[PDB]
Structure formats: C-alpha cells, structure tokens
C-alpha cells in the first residue's frame, strides 16, 4: 500500500463517474500520499535546486495522476478542464473481480489474461500490461480476504499478458 496505488484506490472508491484535477486535490486522504511523495521530490532535488514544498506538493500530485494515465486506468476526459473519467479504473476492477470469480468457481490454478482482450471487452485501447497487473494483483489480495476457505496463495506472472496462479485451501 503506496503511492499510486494508495491513490488508485482512493479513486477506485468515490462513486463519482468523474473528478476534476482540481478538485481532486483538495481530498483530504489524496493529500496524505502527496505530502508522502512530496518528501522524497525534497530529497531527491539536485545540489542547489530549491523549490518550495508545495511546489512538490503539486509536482507529486501530478506525477502521481499521470503514473494512472499512463497505464490507461483513469482517462484524461477532458484537457481543458482537467478531469478524469473514473470509468475505465472501475470497469476494470469489475472486469477483474468477474475473471477471478470465474476461474474459482472453475479451480483453474494458472490461466490467462491477454491485453488486447481487455481493449476489446471493455473498451479502453490505452490499458497496459501494468496496468492490468495492478487491478489484479489488489483484486486478489481481497478476494484472499473475503475467501479464506477457498484461495490460498496466488501470482501473476507476465506474457502482452499476465499468466495468473491460483492454489486453493478446501
């Protein structure tokens, strides 16, 4: 649980199709990862380069939105205006939750994911391998949790594609 993926879930609950950067920012839990980030942009700054913490404070922040557009898991809905289509990160997760369901429900132990199906189902041509990765890997850390009598351990392994592994308890 850290940096973009404490934001990822930040924005994965919020009920709202859609958020302007700027409003975004004035959350109060967004502003506990920035803060976070923030320090380490203060360590990192080179030999006599000396900006203003809040000037990290907002170049965390924006790097930490655009680690997530990057991979296609929230989408910049408008440039103009800078808010953020929610959908995609959402659908995702739903698109997750129902492949892991499934797979249970069938005790596969090591099946396949491939991207270009996920462009295609859902319809996000941006999504990436990371990107798929990461909604995973949280949906089996809390299928683990919601099913203890039923998945044990799991992996996800990497093709263009994730590989993922399933071992049960009963």
Known sequence: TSAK???????????????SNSDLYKLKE???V???????????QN?????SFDSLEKE??????????????????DKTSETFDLLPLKNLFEYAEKRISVLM???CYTGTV????????????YITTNGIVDVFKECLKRTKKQYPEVLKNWWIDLDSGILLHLEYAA
């Open 5 to 19: 993926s404490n934001l990822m879930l930040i924005l994965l609950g919020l009920q709202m199709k859609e958020i």
């Open 60 to 77: 965390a922040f924006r790097d930490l939105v655009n680690r997530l557009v990057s991979q296609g898991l929230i989408g910049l809905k």
């Open 47 to 51: 030999v006599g380069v000396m900006k």
């Open 34 to 44: 920035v803060t976070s980030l923030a320090s380490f942009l203060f360590q990192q």
């Open 114 to 125: 491939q991207l270009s199906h996920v462009q295609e189902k859902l319809h996000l041509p």
């Open 105 to 107: 429900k069938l005790q």
């Open 30 to 32: 967004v502003r506990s």
